[PDB]
């Protein structure tokens, strides 16, 4: 039931499964490729407060994995470390063979706690989490991934940075996030913020020196009138 795309040249058609189509050619298996695409390429929102609303927990359903040979570069990748309130892990350790997605402009690393009702975290729209050369139905702990889909087509004849967040209520609808600048220094995270904005704020804070230099923590709140980027 899996469709294949056929590229005649620049022209792409979905293969007709029932028709013979003597026109179509396949000379070797090297013309058959599994390519992964990111959901960000379809314009889905990528900020942390919105991306987590597409993920959730379920029990009683095992994970599945497929491979892909090529894929695109992601502007926004995610990496989760979520614990239950009592310290138990929410996400399973990745099995060997799983490695993080190879090319990300930014990695949004979110650590924190929250209720985790299920056995695994699954994508709610049915998308796959993309790992090194593997697409998975579930999220594995500590490993960088991108959200995406796999196409299956027949062919014609690095510096990156990390943005850290800390959160509570990870698995629920009403949650809170802070952007980490230093161990004691935080910024309230808004849904209107872009990766570029947060990085500019990180430079502003270290440069001005307005960081916590005591034993407690500081949280900066953004003035709603200053725009972002």
């Amino acid at each position, epitope marked *: 039931s899996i469709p294949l795309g056929v590229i005649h040249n620049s022209t792409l058609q979905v293969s007709d499964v029932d028709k013979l189509v003597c026109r179509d050619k396949l000379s070797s298996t090297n013309q058959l490729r599994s390519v992964g695409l990111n959901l960000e390429g379809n314009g889905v929102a990528t900020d942390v407060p919105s991306v987590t609303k597409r993920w959730g927990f379920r029990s009683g359903v095992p994970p599945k994995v497929v491979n892909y040979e090529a894929g695109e570069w992601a502007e926004n990748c995610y990496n989760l470390e979520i614990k239950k*309130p*009592d310290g138990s892990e929410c996400l399973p350790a990745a099995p060997d063979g799983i490695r993080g997605f190879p090319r990300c402009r930014y990695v949004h690393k979110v650590s*924190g*706690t929250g*209720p985790c009702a299920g056995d695994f975290a699954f994508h709610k729209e049915g998308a796959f989490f993309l790992y090194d050369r593997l697409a998975s139905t579930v999220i594995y702990r500590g490993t960088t991934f991108a959200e995406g889909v796999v196409a299956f087509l027949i062919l014609p004849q690095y510096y990156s940075t990390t943005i850290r967040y*800390q959160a*509570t*209520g990870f698995g*629920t609808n009403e949650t*809170e996030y*802070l952007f980490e600048v230093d161990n004691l220094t*935080y910024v309230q995270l808004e849904s209107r913020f872009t990766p570029q904005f947060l990085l500019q*704020l990180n430079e*502003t*804070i270290y440069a*001005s020196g*307005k960081r*916590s230099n*005591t*034993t*407690g*923590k*500081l*949280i*900066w*709140k*953004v*003035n709603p009138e*200053i725009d972002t980027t």
Partner: antibody, heavy 133, light 108 residues
């Protein structure tokens, strides 16, 4: 007006631990700072340790490091404390308390708010814990 | 560590008489961040004053106080029968929060 509701009196045997709950009600966890204190009869009231749920972190007075664990769970609006290594010397009324963040520095970005354990405005009724056998 | 000492151990005063309570630190309290609380037997202490001079919410105007550096004072203009409590000073200007031993007001 915010209130703190604590569990009732308990009796533990020497060598065990006591878990005391404190429910936040009349408000929500928000960004408030919670702490626990201890007052043995005839003694003043000492800070044991505390938690700030929004970071999900806690710390302790040096005399209780390794003995006290403080946790919280947003979904039940509850702060919990556990005191281990119990001996009869530990008999005391244990209290939970809550206080505000203080306003900090201001810049063009926006305003800062400071989080540490300061003064307590809201107090629970106290849980009496006795250690004996 | 800022160590706080309060005095007198017990102030013996008639009802309606002015109460003066002293707290003295071994070290200055940053930002004059010292608080006072009123404790009754069987009850958690109620915050009366914080930040040396800021009156706490719901506290009667008969309660006052001031201070800076190491020297802080709480006073009650007329001590009512209901106010013959154990009073404590606490400092939060420097971590950890520390506190005095407490003093009592008693009826003469």
């Amino acid at each position: 007006q915010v209130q703190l509701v604590q569990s009732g009196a308990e009796v533990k045997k020497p060598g065990s631990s006591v878990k005391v709950s404190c429910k936040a009600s009349g408000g929500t966890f928000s960004r408030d700072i919670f702490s626990w204190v201890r007052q043995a009869p005839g003694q003043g009231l000492e800070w044991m340790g505390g938690i700030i749920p929004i970071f999900g972190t806690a710390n302790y007075a040096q005399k209780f490091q390794g003995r006290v664990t403080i946790t919280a769970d947003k979904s039940t609006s509850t702060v919990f404390m556990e005191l281990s290594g119990l001996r009869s010397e530990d008999t005391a009324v244990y209290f939970c308390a809550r206080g505000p963040p203080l306003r900090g520095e201001r810049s063009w970005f926006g305003e800062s708010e400071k989080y540490d354990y300061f003064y307590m405005d809201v107090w629970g009724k106290g849980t009496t814990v006795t250690v004996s056998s | 560590q800022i160590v706080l000492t309060q005095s007198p151990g017990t102030l013996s005063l008639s009802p309606g008489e002015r109460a003066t309570l002293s707290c003295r630190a071994s070290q200055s309290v940053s930002n004059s961040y010292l608080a006072w609380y009123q404790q009754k037997p069987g009850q958690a202490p109620r915050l009366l004053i914080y930040g040396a001079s800021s009156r706490a919410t719901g506290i009667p105007d008969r309660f006052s106080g001031s201070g800076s550096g190491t020297d802080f004072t709480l006073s009650i203009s007329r001590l009512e029968p209901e106010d013959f409590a154990v009073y404590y000073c606490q400092q939060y200007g420097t971590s950890p929060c520390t506190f005095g031993q407490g003093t009592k007001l008693e009826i003469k």
